[PDB]
């Protein structure tokens, strides 16, 4: 606990400051410290945690993609051997990414998920668990790739089952879960038809429930519905 001596409330305050300053590594460290205080997280706090790590790992993923692309070109038929450096540095970024994912997964396993009883918290964390196993799957190539994929699938599936039982079809967490599980199907599980079906059914069921919403709730739900449509347009 590097943050063990800081007050929980101070960690949350500093996470918000780090967000405003676009210091997402700091933000993630502050929110890891907050989680490690052992108390459940409120809605706002869960989203601070998620925003922080999504931004950190998102930057790592973007860098990994650049380096992996350079590496594949160096391996084409006709390339001039540029030694081990591209592979080494891609491996360095990959190991750092895996470490961040393992950290987040560790927080979810110790002990955020087991204490999460409300649908909004439990579905949120299980979505996160699917997301970070999905990021591990994006770089996985060994004896474990299938198991990592199945861990992502299992987390997303439990989240989906709870969300369909306990939340309306326009709930933004339910929508974002389905968006991401659909991308999992398309990009990770080589199941584009499942990806398209899930996105379309999610969109249509949400459409039919929009009439129940306030103007602010409508804005949130239609935002994610547009992402579902964007993906469907990319895939069809």
């Amino acid at each position: 606990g590097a943050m063990g001596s800081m007050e929980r409330a101070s960690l949350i305050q500093k996470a918000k400051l780090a967000e405003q300053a676009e210091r997402y590594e700091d933000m993630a460290a502050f929110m890891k410290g907050a989680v490690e205080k052992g108390e459940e997280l409120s809605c706002e706090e869960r989203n601070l945690l998620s925003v922080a790590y999504k931004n950190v790992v998102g930057g790592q993923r973007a860098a990994w993609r650049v380096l992996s692309s350079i590496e594949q070109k160096s391996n084409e038929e006709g390339s001039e051997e540029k030694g081990p450096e591209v592979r080494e540095y891609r491996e360095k970024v990959e190991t750092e990414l895996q470490g961040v994912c393992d950290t987040v997964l560790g927080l979810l396993d110790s002990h955020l998920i087991k204490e999460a009883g409300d649908a909004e918290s439990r579905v949120f964390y299980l979505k996160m668990k699917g997301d970070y196993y999905r990021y591990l799957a994006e770089v996985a190539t060994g004896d474990d790739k299938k198991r990592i994929i199945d861990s992502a699938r299992s987390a997303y599936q439990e989240a989906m089952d709870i969300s369909k039982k306990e939340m309306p079809p326009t709930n933004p967490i339910r929508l974002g879960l389905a968006l991401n599980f659909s991308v999992f199907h398309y990009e990770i599980a080589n199941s584009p038809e499942e990806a398209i079906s899930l996105a379309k059914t999610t969109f249509d069921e949400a459409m039919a429930d929009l009439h129940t919403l306030s103007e602010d709730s409508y804005k949130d739900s239609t935002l994610i519905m547009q992402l579902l449509r964007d993906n469907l347009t990319l895939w069809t």
């Binding site: 974002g176 991401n180 991308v183 993906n231 990319l234």
Partner: peptide, 5 residues
Amino acid sequence: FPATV
């Protein structure tokens, strides 16, 4: 890449 949230 496709959209995720």
